[PDB]
């Protein structure tokens, strides 16, 4: 199985497996199938939300790309192909992370000739429009760097609504937009709807054009609703069926009270094996933070992985009791499901998340609860795709370590994460009267260090062999080596030339690693050595490293529990911030030679329904033999119901 698909620009395309899909019942597979169809119909929605020209530009390049009869080896065509592939990755003409608009690496004359040589019937022309007019429309949008430069703008002294190419507002200023929603809000509403979540705000009166059946985007929403109605007929139980039924109504009415009702039912549906997301969910695509991008995920519970986190959870008190922290900081009584993604769509595709924490409505989270999950097969795909990429070959000090990391690194890294997330933050307590914010700007860095150290100290414990979480007592050394190598050295690849460590998690890792390095130095517990001008991290006593991790854990627990700001500051400023310029440049030059793309995204598997003569389903199969170009072209042909212009 090949986890890697292709690489272009600053992007690498991967694939993921859907483990245990074949173990589901046939009816369960049917429900997954329908939900995945409901997911795939939404792709055009996100494109349009990210820019009113995106569907035209996508469809123009797509018509050129698939019918081109010219020299496909020529640089103009190759750069146009890269551009289109970036548009597919980013669901628009702007960088999926940076928001800046892509720079075409091909000439306008080339595109003009390519467009004119395409059957005009195949171009996304409006009625009565010519190919020349479509180019006059789109070429400034594509080629002029000053036009629609950012998909989301965060700058001051600018009208962020007009300065942002996203398509949630049309002909409305930022002050008009914020005022509309500032006025609509009711402070006294204890169960407030998510004002403005599902509409374009336009001036036509400032009014809302709601995304719903019979409204804006109805061509795609109608298809989503069709497949959801199919899914409704094969629900696993009545709770999940009610979720599906309410979600259909929300799409049919556009009512935001239906959305809250749906979200309440969704949080109550905690038992079902299969779950999904399908809606306008997160609001980061909007510079005002009001409108939500469309996304979808279909999934089923990863039983084995969830069981492992439940083993960790149910032993919370054992880890607390045996902790190396001072007894006065220990909780006397102290008390994370994993899901398998079946398909990704909308703002989860192809660039996706490793965890989902929903719903967003605070009053629903407070009174009814929430679902917070991690996506095990996406995390695993990340890990598997990295094997053999050249990184450990370049930076690991010797072949024994490389062999131990290849064998155990993935397992013990994820286990360390599980310890950090399931127990590390929950462990320990403040002393009476101590302000939780006593560490001020250092609080986040110290708190993440504390949880990481809890995980590091315990990933090495023999208890974990007994508990059947690690297969033998040496496995932890893989995680120990990579944590110290990343903390002292290889995370510098994320720092720009001439800068220091800024982000809290990067700081907490350098903090831990540099402290252990300093404290172990008289016994050469950890060394940094050069061969042929390259630096390597050398670990000489793994047992002493565990003891040092424990000593720093105790010290950091004391800092937090007593509110020791000066202690926090001392640790952060002395260990966590300063970058050695020579090491930084050395690591970057070694890293850039590996040609590793900084961003990843995933293609989906392909599901097929098998029916009999009458059409009764007899099986549902999953396949992985589709690449990036194939899947994008197939989605644009078969899962692309929106008009090119949505006005
Ligand atoms: Cl415009
Ligand atoms: Cl939700
Ligand atoms: Cl490697
Ligand atoms: Zn954390």
Numbering used by the authors: 24 to 227, 230 to 360, 364 to 675
Task: Give sentences copied directly from the paper behind this entry.
DPP III (EC 3.4.14.4; earlier names: dipeptidyl arylamidase III, dipeptidyl aminopeptidase III) is a cytosolic zinc-metallopeptidase of the M49 family. This exopeptidase catalyses the hydrolysis of the penultimate peptide bond of its oligopeptide substrates with unsubstituted N-termini, thereby sequentially removing N-terminal dipeptides. Despite a low sequence identity (17–21%), the overall structure of BtDPP III is very similar to the previously reported crystal structures of human and yeast DPP III and consists of two domains separated by a wide cleft. The catalytic zinc ion is positioned in the lower part of the upper structural domain, coordinated by His448, His453, and Glu476.
The wild-type DPP III crystals were obtained only after the initial crystallization conditions with Se-Met labelled Cys-null protein were determined. Both proteins crystallized in space group P3121, with one molecule in the asymmetric unit. Therefore, only the wild-type structure was considered in further discussion. The coordination of the zinc ion is square pyramidal with two water molecules in the remaining positions. In contrast, in both human and yeast DPP III, zinc exhibits a tetrahedral coordination with a single water molecule that is considered to be important for the generally accepted catalytic mechanism involving water activation by Glu461. The superimposed protein backbones of ligand-free bacterial and ligand-free human DPP III structures gave rise to an RMSD value of 4.41 Å.
